[PDB]
Amino acid sequence: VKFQVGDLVWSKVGTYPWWPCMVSSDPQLEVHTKINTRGAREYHVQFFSNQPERAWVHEKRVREYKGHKQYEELLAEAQKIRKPRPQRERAQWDIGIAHAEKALKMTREERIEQYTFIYID
Ligand SMILES: Cc1noc(C)c1-c1n[nH]cc1-c1ccncc1
Numbered sequence: 679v680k681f682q683v684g685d686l687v688w689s690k691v692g693t694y695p696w697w698p699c700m701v702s703s704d705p706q707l708e709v710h711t712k713i714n715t716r717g718a719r720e721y722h723v724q725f726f727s728n729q730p731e732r733a734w735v736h737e738k739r740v741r742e743y744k745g746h747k748q749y750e751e752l753l754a755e756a757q758k759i760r761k762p763r764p765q766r767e768r769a770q771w772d773i774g775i776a777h778a779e780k781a782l783k784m785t786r787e788e789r790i791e792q793y794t795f796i797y798i799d
Contacts, residue, residue, distance in 0.1 A: 681721050683710050684786035686743035686778055688752060689723050689735045695763075695771065696752040698743055698778035699723035700789060702732070705797040724795055726774035726781070732795065745782065746775045 681687060685701040703710045704722045712734070714720050719737040724730065741752065753760075763771075781789045 679711055679719075680737065681711070681740065681742075682786075684790045686781055686789070687721070687723060688741045688743050688748070689725070689733070690739040690752075691733050691735055694767070696741070696749060697771065698726045698746075698774045700726065700778075700781065700793055702794055704732075704734070705795075724793065726777040726793075727770055728773050729770065730795060743778060743782070746779060 681701045683701055683703055687699050687701055688696045689699045690696050700723065701710050701721055702724050704712075707722075710722045712720055712722075714734070714736075720734045721737060721740050722732065722734055723740070724732050741748075777793075781793065784792065
């Protein structure tokens with residue numbers, strides 16, 4: 679178990695770019711990590727965004743968030759070929775990064791307090 683609740687991570691989910699997140703406990707399972715139905719480890723994360731979302735993410739698609747400038751190192755893992763950055767998505771990503779940069783300056787307990795989502799049935 680590489681990550682704990684409140685840890686800042688980048689997550690690569692679906693068609694979206696590497697995205698700033700916080701590890702958190704699933705509101706129903708009450709765990710932040712599990713072994714999936716294919717036998718692989720996953721972590722439960724919250725995406726920093728103006729549109730809050732959560733997901734279970736394979737451990738290979740989760741990375742410690744050390745700072746926003748790490749994005750270039752993540753793009754490297756994959757003439758130089760670069761994907762363009764769609765305007766609306768870029769704007770949402772910049773918002774998420776601003777929150778993650780603020781969270782980086784907080785303690786783990788402060789981050790848990792400030793950002794853990796409230797889930798309503
Ligand atoms: C959208 C969306 N909805 O559910 C999930 C999961 C996502 C998602 N996947 N990868 C990144 C995001 C995300 C991007 C922007 N804001 C929040 C979440």
